[PDB]
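Notebook B, p. 112. Complex prediction, attempt 2.
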Amino acid sequence: MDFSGKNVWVTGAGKGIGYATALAFVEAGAKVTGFDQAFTQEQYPFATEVMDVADAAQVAQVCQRLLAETERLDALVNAAGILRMGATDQLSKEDWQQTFAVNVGGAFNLFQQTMNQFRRQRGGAIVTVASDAAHTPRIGMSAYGASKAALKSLALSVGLELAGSGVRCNVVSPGSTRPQEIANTILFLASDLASHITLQDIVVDGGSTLGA
Amino acid sequence: MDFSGKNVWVTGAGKGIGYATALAFVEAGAKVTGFDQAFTQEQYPFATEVMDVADAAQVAQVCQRLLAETERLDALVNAAGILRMGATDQLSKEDWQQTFAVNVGGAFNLFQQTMNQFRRQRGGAIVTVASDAAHTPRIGMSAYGASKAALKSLALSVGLELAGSGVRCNVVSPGSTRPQEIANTILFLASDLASHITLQDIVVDGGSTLGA
Amino acid sequence: MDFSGKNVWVTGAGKGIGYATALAFVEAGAKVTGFDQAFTQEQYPFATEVMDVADAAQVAQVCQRLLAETERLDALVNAAGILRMGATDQLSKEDWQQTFAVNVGGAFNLFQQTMNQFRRQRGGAIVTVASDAAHTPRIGMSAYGASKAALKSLALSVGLELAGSGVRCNVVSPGSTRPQEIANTILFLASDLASHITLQDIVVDGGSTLGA
Amino acid sequence: MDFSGKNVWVTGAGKGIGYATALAFVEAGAKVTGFDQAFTQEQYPFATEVMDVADAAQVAQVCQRLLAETERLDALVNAAGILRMGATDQLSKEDWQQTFAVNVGGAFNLFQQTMNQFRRQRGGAIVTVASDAAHTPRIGMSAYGASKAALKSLALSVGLELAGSGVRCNVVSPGSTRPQEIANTILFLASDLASHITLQDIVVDGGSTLGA
C-alpha cells in the first residue's frame, strides 16, 4: 500500500492480529515499532519494545522515551487484547479484572501517552481493534464483549477529541480469530485512501452480526 | 402502575435516579429494598441495605442473606453510578479505575449474585441505567461513556443468558441529570405492559443523540 | 393512562395494531378519530373517517376538513401498513409499489397535512409503527423491511423538523403480529410519562433483533 | 488494486460517484460496463449502456441481453441516485415519487435482474451507494434520507439472500458530494482484501454522524 517514510506503532505485536498488522506495515515500507507484554522469539522484522499496555507506569516510561526521538507518529494501532470466557455468574474476578485491565485500560494508557503528540503534529491515524462481541451479545463472552464495547466507545471519544487536529480514528471489529484479512482492513483505514473516514467501525466476521 | 405484591431491588437508591425509582416502586405498591454504598438520612420509605455494588465480597454477603429469605425477585434495577469528567489524557488513574469499578463492576457483582435466582424462579425483569454517553461521544466524558457502554453491553449479554428463563432485561440511557421521568421509564420496562420488550435501550435525553 | 380531553388520530384503525391502539385511547378517555382505507363493521367505539393514507388527494381533503374544526391534535399514530412477502427477485412490481405507497407514502401524506398543525399548536406527540424488519434483514421481507426502514427514517426526520415546536416523535417496531402489547407501548410514548423521549424506536419482538 | 480479468457493472456511471468508480475500475484493469439514464459525452473509457435503473422494463431488456453474453459478474456497484430537498410538508409529490423511483426502485430492478447470476456463479461482490442521510436525520433531506435508508435495508436483505452463494454485499454511505475517495472505498469493498466483510456500511463523511 506504500507506507514508506511513515512511522507506525502496533500494540499486541507479538502474536495474532497485532503481529500480522506489524508485518503488513513492514511489507508496505513503514518504520514499525511493535509493542507487547513480552516477546517470545529472538528475531522480529520490526523494532520491538517490551511494553504491557495494561501497565500504566511502563507505558509512560516507554512512550515518553520513544516520543522524544520521533518527529511524528503516522499511525497507532491498538491490537492488544485478551479473551476470557464463561457464563456471567461463573466468571472469576481475576478474569473479569484482567479483561478490563488489558482490553480497555491498555488503549486508555496509550491514549494518555500519545494524544498530545497527535495534537501537536496535527494529523495521522489511529486504528483500534475491538470485536464483533461488542456489537451483539455472544454466548460465553459477556465480559469480553463488554470490555470491547468500552474500548470502541473510548476510541470514538478520543476520535472526537482529536478531530480538530485532523486525526482519523477508526475501529475494526473482527470475529473469532484470518489475522491477515484484519490487517488488510487496518492498513486501509490507516492509509490516505481512507482520509475522510473517521469514527467508523468495520465488522470483519462474514456478516455474523447481520449489519449490527 | 400497581406493583403490589412484587419484590423489587434498586441499587444506588440513596440519591438521584435510584432514589426516585425506589420511591416510585413504593408508591406503586411494591416491596422495595434499596441498596447504596452508604445511607445519609435516618429514615427511608423503603427497606435499606448498605451495599457498595463495587465491593464484590459485600455484595456476596448481603445478596446471599437476602435471597435465602425471598421467594422471588420480581425486578432488579441497577441504578448505581459515578460520573468523573476530563479530557482522556488528563483523567487521573483513580478516576478511571473508580468509574469502571462502580459503573461496570457493580452490575457485574449484582448479576453474579442474582442470575441463579432469576433462572430458578423463571421470570422477572431487570432494568439497567446506562447513559446517552454510551451512544455518542460526549466532550469530557470519554471514560464515563466507555464504562456505560460496557454496562449496556453486559446488561444485554445477561439478557441473552436469561432469555430462556423468561427474564426481560432492558436498559434506560438518561442524559445529564429529570430523575422522576427516568423512574417512569424504568417502571414501564419493569411492568407487564412491556412483557415482550427485551434487550432494548431507551434513551431519555430529549433527542440529543438524534436516534443513536 | 388518562388521555381524557386529548384529541388523538390513529391510521390503519380498522384492524390489527391501529384498531387495538384506537380502542386503548378510547378506554383512556381520549377523543379518538380512526382512519382506514375502508371500514368493514357497521359500528366502532371511535369516530371513523374513510381515508386511505396512500391516497394523497383524499388525505388532503379529509385532514383539511378535520383540522379546521379541531383546536389541537394531541397525538398522531401512524399504524397503517401492508405486508407483501417474497424473495427479492420474485416479488411482483405491483407488490413492490403498493408496499412503498402504503408503508412510506402514507405517513408522508399525513405529515404533509399535519406538520403545520403541530408547529402552530407547539407540542403534542407522534408515534409511528414500523417493524423489527427495519432493524435486521428478515427472510422473505426485503421490500417490507426496506419500506419500514424508510418509514422510520422519515419519522425521525419529521421529529427533528418538529423538535423546535416541542413535538415528541417516536417509533415502535413490532415483530410479526400481540396488538394489545404494541398499543401499550404506543400509549406510553404518547403520554406525558415519556415527555423527554423523542426520536426513539422501541422494538417489541421478544428480543429477536438482539438489541439491533 | 488489480481487478484485471474481472467483469464489473457500475450504475449512475455518467457522472459523480458512479463515474469516478467506473474510471477507477478501468485503471485497476477491470472490464467495465457503465449504465446511466443517458450519456452526455461522445466518448467514455468504459463500455456504456443506456439504462435508467428506475425503468424496470428497460433494466430487464438490457441486463438480460448482457447476462446471456457474460460468464460472470465479479462486481455490481449501485451508484445511481437523485437528490431532491425541501421541508417534509413542502416537498412536491413529483419529487417524492422520483426520489423513491430512482433511489430504491433502481437497485431493486438491478437485484431482480442480477440475483440469479450471482447465485449460479456462486460468488462476487455487490456495493451499494447510500448516504449518511440514511444514518441521521438531516435538515431538508427527509425524503432523500428515507429513500437511502430503504436502499441500505434492501441491500443488506439481498446480502442475506445471497450469503449462501458466497456473495459479499456491502454499503458505502457518503456525505454531501470527494467522488474519488468514495471510489477508493468501493474498490476496497469489491476487492479480495475485503473477502470476509459483508452486510457492512462504511460512512465516508469526515465523522459527521459521530459513529451513527
